[PDB]
Amino acid sequence: YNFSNCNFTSITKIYCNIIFHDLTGDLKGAKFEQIEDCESKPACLLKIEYYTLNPIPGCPSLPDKTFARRTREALNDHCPGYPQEVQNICLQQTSQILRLWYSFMQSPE
């Protein structure tokens, strides 16, 4: 999908006022070295979506967490045409996602 048509202003308000708090809330201060970066709002949203809604080995439940469902709903609402478990892995992925949001916030449209 091409995230270039998303309303970034709306998504930003949702991230700043809800999703950000959900992420920091889940991380409880844990952080990990950052693996990837991104340099535009559309490119960051693409990575965010991919990290957030695709399960990974060690944290199958990730796409079902509240911050993930809210991310899905925010993209759905504001992007036209948008379609066991180890806690340390969950945290690692959650930390990556939060930092991709920071990149989103710092990137141009």
Partner: protein, 183 residues
């Protein structure tokens, strides 16, 4: 305990304190040596200043003599942002009895500004906040002298939780109906 501060998205300053050495890179290119160490008289390092890039991941590797890792990090440089203070603050009495506080913008987004004031006569500071580049402070007495100061504060959702506010500006003193020599 190692500290990292990114000064105004211009430089990154890493401070420690054996003789440590620092390598760094942006992205996945080749590690590079610290471009400028802070050295003691005996020639042991105390820190490093390097350039900040607004994008890309800054990897830091601090090693002991012998090549052992003592500190590692990998985040955007802005993760450690401390903005410069605002350059010059202006205070303007409006006819309403309000004061408009204004300042020049920083060269990057995502900052809130905190404006404090109190009577120039060790009382508590009152604070108000807002985005660039002005805000209004109401209810001031036209004949009393007030101190104002401002700082820039990186928004947590924008830059994250390791960013920190600038230093306060030097005080700017206001006199509603009085001359400056009344303050």
């Amino acid at each position: 305990d190692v500290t990292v501060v990114c000064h105004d998205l211009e430089t990154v300053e890493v401070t420690w304190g054996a003789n440590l050495s620092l390598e760094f890179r942006y992205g996945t290119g080749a590690l590079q040596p610290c471009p400028r160490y802070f050295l003691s008289g005996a020639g042991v390092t105390s820190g490093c200043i390097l350039p900040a890039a607004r994008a890309g991941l800054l990897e830091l590797a601090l090693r002991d003599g012998g090549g052992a890792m003592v500190f590692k990090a990998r985040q955007r440089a802005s993760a450690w942002l401390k903005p410069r203070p605002p350059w010059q603050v202006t205070l303007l009495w409006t006819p309403d009895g309000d004061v408009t506080v204004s300042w020049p913008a920083h060269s990057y987004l995502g900052l809130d500004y905190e404006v404090q004031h109190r009577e120039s006569n060790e009382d508590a500071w009152q604070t108000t906040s807002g985005p660039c580049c002005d805000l209004t402070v109401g209810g001031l007495d036209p004949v009393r002298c007030y101190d104002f100061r401002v700082r820039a504060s990186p928004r947590a959702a924008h830059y994250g939780l390791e960013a920190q506010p600038s230093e306060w500006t030097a005080v700017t003193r206001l006199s509603g109906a009085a001359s400056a020599a009344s303050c």
